[PDB]
Every structure is written in C-alpha cells, then in structure tokens.
Symmetry: C2
Subunit: 264 residues, 2 copies
C-alpha cells in the first residue's frame, strides 16, 4: 500500500545501522505515523500476498481473553508456538490484559467491555483506551507487548483508532499488525452502529532486518493495487460472539508472496 | 515554533466540531505527530511568552514520586491545586506510577530507575518505556494521565524520546507538555553521557477550545523566533538529585504572552 511502501523507503533512506535483541543487524528509525482511511478499502498489503486466516483467529482469541494457545492449535494457527511452553501457556499476554487486567485489590478489569460502554454512552470521551502494557506483569509474559496501547475516537458517525506499537519489524510483522487492528475497528464499529473511520498507526523503534533488504527492494519495485473490501456476513450480538466464517475479503489481487527468512 | 503553529493551523483546517468533558465546544483532530531536534534548540514556544518555573518544579516533583502537592505549594506552584483534596493529595497520579507502580504481588516498580538501567546496559532495547496508564488505579487518581506513556531510543550517541498524549488542549496545555519532556530528555541524556536527539510528540484527541479561537489566530499571525538554549549548570550524581537552580534558559526572546480563558 502507498503508506506502507513509503515507510519502507523512509527506513532505507534515513534508518541508522545497529542491532536487535542479540543477532541480526537492522536499519531503524524512531517515531513514525501513518493513516489509513478504512472507507477507502481494507488495508491488506497488495505488493506481496498475505492471508487473513491467522490474523482473524488470533484476534478472536485475544477477545476471548484465554492466553493458552489451545484454540489456535485446534485451528492450525502456529504463530505463537515459538513462545508457548509445554502446556501451551504464554503468561498474561495481550488477551489477559485486554479482558482481565489484574489489580492489586483483587479485580480483573475488562478493558474491551469498558471501551464498548464508553463508545455507546460517552463517545466523546478522550480516554477510550485499551492498554496491554501492564508493568507489573511483564516478567511473567512470554513476550512483552509489541502493540502496546490503543485508543478510540468518534466523529461524524465514524470510529477511528490509533495504535502505539513500541517496536516493529516492517517487512515481516507490520502487514499483519495493520490488518489485525483494521479488522478490530470494523468489528467495534459494527457493534456500535458506526461507520469506520481512520486507523492511525504510530510506531517507536521501526526497523528492517539486514537479511530482508533484497526482499524490501523487490516489494518496492511493485505498484500497489486497489485495496480489497472487507465483508462481515453476520451481525453478532456482542464483540465476543464473532466467528471465523463471519469475515470475507473481496477484490484482493496481490503480487506474489515473498518469504521472510529469520535467524535463530 | 514551526511545528506547533502548523498543528494549530491543521486543527483549524481539518478539525471537526464537538464538545469536551461537558461544556466548551472544541475543534479536534485525532492522531498527530511532530518532531523536535533538540540539537536545534530548546522547544519553548516563542510566539507567546512562556515560563519554565512551574514546568521545572513539576518535573522534579514527578521524579521524586510523592503525589502530595506539599512540595509544589512550598514553591508557589499552583497548577495542581484545582485537583488536590483538603490534605493536598491527588491519588496515584504520574509520580506514583513513574516511581512506584504497584503490583498485585506487593511490589512498587521504579520505572525511572529501570529505564536508566536499560539506557546504560542495554541501549538498543526496544522496550525502554515508562507508563503512567495503570488501569487498576485510574479511579483513585484525581485525573487520568494525559501524557500517558513514553519511550526512549538511542542511536549515534543521541537520546530520543517519544511521548503518547491521549488528549491535548493545543493552546493552553501543549506548550507546557513539550518543554517538560524536552527537559527530561536533557536530564536523562546528561545522566547517561549522551547527546540529545529528537523529542517526538504523538497525540490522540488533539483540540482547540472554541473560546481560544481569537487567541489562536493572534498567535498564528506571529513569526516564530530562534529557539532558546537550555543550560544545565551542574551535573548531579543521579536523576533524582537535580535542583531548580540547575536549569537556565539563554536567548529566549518571545512575543507577548496571551491569556487562556477557561470555563468552569
């Protein structure tokens, strides 16, 4: 997509050379923001073939709040396998914080229900927020939240959402991330009888791995195509009642897929 | 400053009309980002006279972690008076979360010390973060955090910082906010023997109150002047040992101050 390709070029042009966790070098920039008007089409990259299967399953899984990968395993979704222990547990990652943020006084805060309550009764609130950055539980998580915090906003009958992503592997992870949150905005908008607005993506340490350079140049040589259209075939009674089969994509005509090699 | 004035104009040009908490209407946009290269000067607005007195005192107060306004009162800093109760308490706002985020297992997490530890031992970390958004303590706070979350980054011997501000009164609050965090970056950089990099400001619900419109047009009619220079007269042994007198501003030549009327 235009916004995505321009970010790749920006990292190439002004990114600084360094390293990651402890291995493959990277080119990185700090602080970036882009916007996707969801009325213009569903933001699924077209310059390389992507699939929504895992994205949809993972989001439904997040919304349910159970951090065990049993559900993902049952549906052959393996993106969390590398981090799950022998019992399939990941610790209190995303879902747990979204649906049951633990407090010192023994309560479990449902941030998703809270946000839906705000959107329906106080849409102009300046604090319609969901945070996965629970400082006191970071050490227990298999991975520290990447998509750490997001906020909603309502104007002119449209629902917008801004995500703060602390770090981002532009080539491998970003396409997945943008589609995931775009899907959530559509679901929340449907439950609130609102039209979709903008998805605003804000990133911290935004990078490209050294071994993804040839792949990046290849993708940049391709012209983006018209964005597809998301179809929700059914209207669930609540945000927790969506099903995999409820979502379909129309008019998706991407360029060939590009593999993403990763070091271990 | 150029970046600040362009934001005011953006809100004027594309902001939508609505309301706030429950009173004065506003023009607002959702999702914005701007960058200040601290090497180009200290980002204290020049198109209207500003002062650093309260900003400095408030930041030292945040760093100490005590949320009672006694210190502010002793120094005639009254910006938190409206929210403090009879005993001068504000609940677990900013400072408490920065220095003693409470966990369900009875610990108090010092995020400032943690970040300094990361900057000195693992500067390439993609999670050098401080969050004030403690979901389980929001109801006990006098006010929900506005400057909610910030992240540091190091490259080419320079320290950068990105702040996520969930909501922002562009005319009254933003000038204060930008200078406050810029000051923190300078202090953290000094303690880490690093040069200052960029301060990246990211906002959510960014607005201008209807009764600040004439004031905004007046400020936009003024040409920004060269940014001043921050001087730190002393090098404290730690981030918790700074004093008010350690900071001085040179070359600050602003336009006349503009009052900000507020409804109650």
């Amino acid at each position: 997509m235009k916004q995505y390709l321009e970010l790749m070029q920006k990292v190439l042009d002004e990114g600084t050379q360094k390293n990651d966790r402890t291995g493959t070098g990277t080119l990185s920039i700090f602080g970036h923001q882009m916007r996707f008007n969801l009325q213009d089409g569903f933001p699924l990259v077209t310059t390389k073939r992507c699939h929504l299967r895992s994205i949809i399953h993972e989001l439904l899984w997040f919304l349910q709040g159970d951090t065990n990968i049993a559900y993902l395993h049952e549906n052959n979704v393996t993106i969390w396998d590398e981090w799950a222990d022998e019992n399939g547990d990941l610790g209190p990652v995303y879902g747990k914080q979204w649906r049951a943020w633990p407090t010192p006084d023994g309560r479990h805060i449902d941030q998703i229900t809270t946000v839906l309550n705000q959107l329906k009764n106080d849409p102009d609130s300046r604090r319609i927020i969901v945070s996965a950055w629970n400082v006191g539980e970071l050490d227990k998580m298999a991975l520290a939240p990447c998509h750490a915090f997001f906020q909603f906003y309502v104007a002119d009958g449209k629902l917008s959402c801004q995500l703060y992503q602390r770090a981002c592997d532009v080539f491998l992870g970003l396409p997945f991330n943008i589609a995931s949150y775009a899907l959530l905005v559509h679901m929340m908008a449907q439950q609130c009888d609102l039209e979709v607005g903008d998805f605003v993506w804000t990133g911290g340490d935004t990078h490209l791995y050294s071994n993804h350079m040839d792949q990046t140049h290849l993708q940049l040589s391709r012209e983006p195509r018209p964005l597809p259209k998301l179809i929700i075939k059914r209207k669930p009674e609540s945000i927790f009642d969506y099903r995999f089969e409820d979502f379909e994509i129309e008019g998706y005509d991407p360029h060939p897929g590009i593999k993403a090699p990763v070091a271990i």
